[PDB]
Amino acid sequence: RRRVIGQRKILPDPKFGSELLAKFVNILMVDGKKSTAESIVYSALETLAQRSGKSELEAFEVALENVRPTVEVKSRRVGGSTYQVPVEVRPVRRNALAMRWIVEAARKRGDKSMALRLANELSDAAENKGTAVKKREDVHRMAEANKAFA
Amino acid sequence: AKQSMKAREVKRVALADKYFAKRAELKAIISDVNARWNAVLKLQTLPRDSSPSRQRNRCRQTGRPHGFLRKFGLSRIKVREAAMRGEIPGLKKASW
Amino acid sequence: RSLKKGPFIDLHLLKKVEKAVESGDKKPLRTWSRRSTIFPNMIGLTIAVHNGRQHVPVFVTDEMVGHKLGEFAPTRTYR
Amino acid sequence: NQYYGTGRRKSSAARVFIKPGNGKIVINQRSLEQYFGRETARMVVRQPLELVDMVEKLDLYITVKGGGISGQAGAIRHGITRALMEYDESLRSELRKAGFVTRDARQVERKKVGLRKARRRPQFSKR
Amino acid sequence: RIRIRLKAFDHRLIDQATAEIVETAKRTGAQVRGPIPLPTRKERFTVLISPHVNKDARDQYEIRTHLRLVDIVEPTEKTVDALMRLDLAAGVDVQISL
Amino acid sequence: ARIAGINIPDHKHAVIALTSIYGVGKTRSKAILAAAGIAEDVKISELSEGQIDTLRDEVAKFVVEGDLRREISMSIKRLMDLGCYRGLRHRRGLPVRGQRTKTNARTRKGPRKP
Amino acid sequence: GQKVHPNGIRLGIVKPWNSTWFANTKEFADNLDSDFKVRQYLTKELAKASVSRIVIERPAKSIRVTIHTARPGIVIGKKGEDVEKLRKVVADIAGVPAQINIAEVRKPELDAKLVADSITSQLERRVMFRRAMKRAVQNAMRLGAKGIKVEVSGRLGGAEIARTEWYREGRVPLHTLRADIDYNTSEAHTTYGVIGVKVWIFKGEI
RNA sequence: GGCCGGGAACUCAAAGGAGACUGCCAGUGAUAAACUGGAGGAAGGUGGGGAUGACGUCAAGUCAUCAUGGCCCUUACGACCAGGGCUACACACGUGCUACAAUGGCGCAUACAAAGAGAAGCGACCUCGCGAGAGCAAGCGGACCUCAUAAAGUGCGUCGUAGUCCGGAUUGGAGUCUGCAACUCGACUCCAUGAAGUCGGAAUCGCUAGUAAUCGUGGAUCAGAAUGCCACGGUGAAUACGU
Numbered sequence A: 001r002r003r004v005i006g007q008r009k010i011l012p013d014p015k016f017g018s019e020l021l022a023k024f025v026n027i028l029m030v031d032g033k034k035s036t037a038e039s040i041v042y043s044a045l046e047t048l049a050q051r052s053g054k055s056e057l058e059a060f061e062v063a064l065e066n067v068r069p070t071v072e073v074k075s076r077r078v079g080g081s082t083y084q085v086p087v088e089v090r091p092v093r094r095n096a097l098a099m100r101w102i103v104e105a106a107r108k109r110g111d112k113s114m115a116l117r118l119a120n121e122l123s124d125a126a127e128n129k130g131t132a133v134k135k136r137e138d139v140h141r142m143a144e145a146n147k148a149f150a
Numbered sequence B: 001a002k003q004s005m006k007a008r009e010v011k012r013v014a015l016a017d018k019y020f021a022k023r024a025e026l027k028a029i030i031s032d033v034n035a036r037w038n039a040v041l042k043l044q045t046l047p048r049d050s051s052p053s054r055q056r057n058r059c060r061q062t063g064r065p066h067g068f069l070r071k072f073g074l075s076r077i078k079v080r081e082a083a084m085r086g087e088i089p090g091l092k093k094a095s096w
Numbered sequence C: 001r002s003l004k005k006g007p008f009i010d011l012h013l014l015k016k017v018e019k020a021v022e023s024g025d026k027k028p029l030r031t032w033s034r035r036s037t038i039f040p041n042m043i044g045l046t047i048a049v050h051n052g053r054q055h056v057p058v059f060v061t062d063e064m065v066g067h068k069l070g071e072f073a074p075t076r077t078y079r
Numbered sequence D: 001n002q003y004y005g006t007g008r009r010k011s012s013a014a015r016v017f018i019k020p021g022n023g024k025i026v027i028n029q030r031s032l033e034q035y036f037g038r039e040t041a042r043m044v045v046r047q048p049l050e051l052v053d054m055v056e057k058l059d060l061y062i063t064v065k066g067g068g069i070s071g072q073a074g075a076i077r078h079g080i081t082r083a084l085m086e087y088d089e090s091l092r093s094e095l096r097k098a099g100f101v102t103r104d105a106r107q108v109e110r111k112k113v114g115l116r117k118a119r120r121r122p123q124f125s126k127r
Numbered sequence E: 001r002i003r004i005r006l007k008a009f010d011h012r013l014i015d016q017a018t019a020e021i022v023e024t025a026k027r028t029g030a031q032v033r034g035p036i037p038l039p040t041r042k043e044r045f046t047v048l049i050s051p052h053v054n055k056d057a058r059d060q061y062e063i064r065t066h067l068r069l070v071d072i073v074e075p076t077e078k079t080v081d082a083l084m085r086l087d088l089a090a091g092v093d094v095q096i097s098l
Numbered sequence F: 001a002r003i004a005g006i007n008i009p010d011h012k013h014a015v016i017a018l019t020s021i022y023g024v025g026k027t028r029s030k031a032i033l034a035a036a037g038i039a040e041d042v043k044i045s046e047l048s049e050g051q052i053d054t055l056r057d058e059v060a061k062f063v064v065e066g067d068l069r070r071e072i073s074m075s076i077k078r079l080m081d082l083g084c085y086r087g088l089r090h091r092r093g094l095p096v097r098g099q100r101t102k103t104n105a106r107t108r109k110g111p112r113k114p
Numbered sequence G: 001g002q003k004v005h006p007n008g009i010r011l012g013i014v015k016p017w018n019s020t021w022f023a024n025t026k027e028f029a030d031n032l033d034s035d036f037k038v039r040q041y042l043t044k045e046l047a048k049a050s051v052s053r054i055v056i057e058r059p060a061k062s063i064r065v066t067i068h069t070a071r072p073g074i075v076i077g078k079k080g081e082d083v084e085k086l087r088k089v090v091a092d093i094a095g096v097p098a099q100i101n102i103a104e105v106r107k108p109e110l111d112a113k114l115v116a117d118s119i120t121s122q123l124e125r126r127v128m129f130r131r132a133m134k135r136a137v138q139n140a141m142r143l144g145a146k147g148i149k150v151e152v153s154g155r156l157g158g159a160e161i162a163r164t165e166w167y168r169e170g171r172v173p174l175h176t177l178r179a180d181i182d183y184n185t186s187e188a189h190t191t192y193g194v195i196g197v198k199v200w201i202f203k204g205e206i
Numbered sequence H: 001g002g003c004c005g006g007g008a009a010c011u012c013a014a015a016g017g018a019g020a021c022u023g024c025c026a027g028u029g030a031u032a033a034a035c036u037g038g039a040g041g042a043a044g045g046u047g048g049g050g051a052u053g054a055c056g057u058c059a060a061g062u063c064a065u066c067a068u069g070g071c072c073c074u075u076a077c078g079a080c081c082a083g084g085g086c087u088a089c090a091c092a093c094g095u096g097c098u099a100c101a102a103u104g105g106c107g108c109a110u111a112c113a114a115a116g117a118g119a120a121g122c123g124a125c126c127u128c129g130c131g132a133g134a135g136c137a138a139g140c141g142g143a144c145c146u147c148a149u150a151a152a153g154u155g156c157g158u159c160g161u162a163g164u165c166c167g168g169a170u171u172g173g174a175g176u177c178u179g180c181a182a183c184u185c186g187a188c189u190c191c192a193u194g195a196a197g198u199c200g201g202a203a204u205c206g207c208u209a210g211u212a213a214u215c216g217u218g219g220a221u222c223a224g225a226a227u228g229c230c231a232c233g234g235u236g237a238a239u240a241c242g243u
Ligand SMILES: [Mg+2]
Pocket: B001, B002, B003
């Protein structure tokens, strides 16, 4: 409300040193088990970076580039009616949502081990193939379909 | 409190001491692995209320069978009530 | 039934039941020591166990020994 | 000659001994790696070092206790950067500039009465 | 070679008893080990404040049992009795041992 | 192989497989191996002849499959036909371990009977 | 109902304990019981003694029992007679060598317990409940002090519906730990109902 | 082996003291209050959290803690004893614990903590026991001794997505211990049995940081029945445009 927090500075990626990558590990992290998280992020970040051949953060970026929404609808209760109005998503949010979607979808990929799942979803994303990108499509389709209010 | 009950406790106290205190030993004795004696094991039948696990402390001040604190020997209520007037030494609102 | 070593019972039933052993079977045995284990001496005897309401005609049986005279007299009334 | 640095965080007391010589690192009478080896921990310890040369700079004697893994590690890093000031009161400006000289006043909160975990308020549901 | 277990409820009091035992003992031979503090055991007490219902009430009290070590090194003939000539304060508690 | 009857566990380690034998758990299964002279990781299926032979022969000691599920019901009856609180409970679909009936007992009685 | 007990919330500072004596967990329990038995007896046997406080120290198997009465004369008796009398009883009631010292009083109109115990007594005397309030206040505020607050519970005048009365002069910051307030109560057993009483006397800040 | 002299440095212990005031800097604000950043500093904007709850509101709760006006019971609404009941079960509602697993299970190896409890107690060592536990018996009224070899975790290996080495309810057989006393109705151990459960509708709850989440630890009551309550520390997030 009146408050004005902001962006809680996150500790840079250890094996690398990228703030973005760092928060990506937290999103996947669970029960405050930060170690277990990294043990999964890298293992899958490697099995993929290998195939792509290019540096992790590149294949990583590309993957996100697809699962990157530009606009989304924001609920608004104005006039005894909840009108769904779309709006361009800020830069920071874009990366966040993407990462969140990637994991949330990767976690439920029915594979064998989280690592493998993550690796796959991360790939499929880099070419609108997995569920991550799917979300963005449904979200982006939400907008425009409400562009009237936009 | 219940006067009747209040005194009920007292009797169980005396008995437990005036008897088992120097008799209950029988257990670790003839009722334990040495020579465990069905006969002696049937003898314990006489005191009953002499058993220790028959008291209920009760608030010394009042008698509340529940709210109790071995330390002060008072009921959860009296403790607070007295502790405030400074009747209890070294006891005050704890915080940290 | 856990009682480690030593089938416990009340002195009452003992002194009374033993008399039955010799005097032979006869009238029941008004007893409240439902927490006492059954013995082969009272085997097929005429006993009686309380249960809040009154007593019940309990009769010892072969296997019916290592148990308590109480686990044969239901207490709570249910439909 | 020899220097000492306290350092502590999250109930984690550490004792560092800045001493000139290559770059040995022995914590609690054990190797740096025999404690944090192959773990994301043995990095913070070197942070103050990696920031002003090490391995070929000097060797300190670490003696930490109380706390935990991240606690120990974080604590030691404090003692080190702390003692460093003794050997050179100038490099501080930089150590501080990187959030080192400071002490994480962050500490587990006591479980308040009424709640379920210092903050966790049990659901009441029925309104 | 003689230990003195000093126990008081309030530090203000205990300190006096200590500074006293040591003060006098210093002029009777013994060099004394020193007025050591030692950890303070504090028993806490949580208890319901309101009678009947209202579990989310409760109230917390505590008892800080302060203590000191003392322990006089190189005791003396007069020293021992020199303590009888000085031993008051009801709030404090002593336990001289070997 | 039948081993004790029907039950033909394969692939799974000898220990974890043997447990399939109606009447044995991690304990009885883990011991029967060494006692017979069989490892743990050993796949009952991959095992050589004798490596399965001894099994049956040794498992013949403790009661299993039929006999167990068989006599096990007899003990339940012994007390039921007796008339003790225990048996009485079974013939009423109520817990004997002395649990609460007014609530939680779906495992004993079953799903709601509204 | 809220508001924490002042003398209790100040048991650490600006306010001394009424029973300063050490004791271990074992006998600490019983140690209070006696402390209790002696107090009531010392209170009953000393009705019109006008006693306010009653500290209790327990040294080596000995007892202190420092009485703070407004009328020591009676408490003393013919050449320490009354006092000596009590002492014996206490020692017996506690089963140990008990003593008893008398303490005067810095104006009763300024002591909590007193102003209370008194203001309540008046009620039983069929005095206008309201009058007692103001009466006690006027004095306290006059004999000194910087603040006072009298409070009579319900059933005033004998109304079918009990109602607590207010009234208070001077500043009485109960929120200030470093304020020192002489607070005490006393129930007035009327011909038809009890009547609680609470007195708040603020003498000085620090 | 701080083990021994020895050393009071360091950690710590615990009494006293210093330190933070929007005090200083600049900017917006009338050259106010303030706000917003910056410096310095362990900490910066009532530093974190406690304690502290105005006048009063609900004839809110409590004559079962206690006290008490009134009204009632006085070989009876009073008092004693054994057994039983308060643990009933076809249901429904609230609060919780443990699961549905591979961020996991299982085996072995193995690292870091805090806070507390204790002479009718904590109880080691060694002996026996599959184990609960038993025998003998030291030490400690306690920074000496004991409760007490923290869990997650880290290494290696196994498992292979299976109602599955998941999950444990249920029940059967046999036992340990507490107390006269374990049927009704204790806790736990051993073997066996191995359900539902595959992340849960409408709806709904808590939480803004050492918080949530998660993992262990102690205590009160107490002979003996904690997943409750109170408390401790390990690891350790996400998000906050805006009303
Ligand atoms: Mg009464």
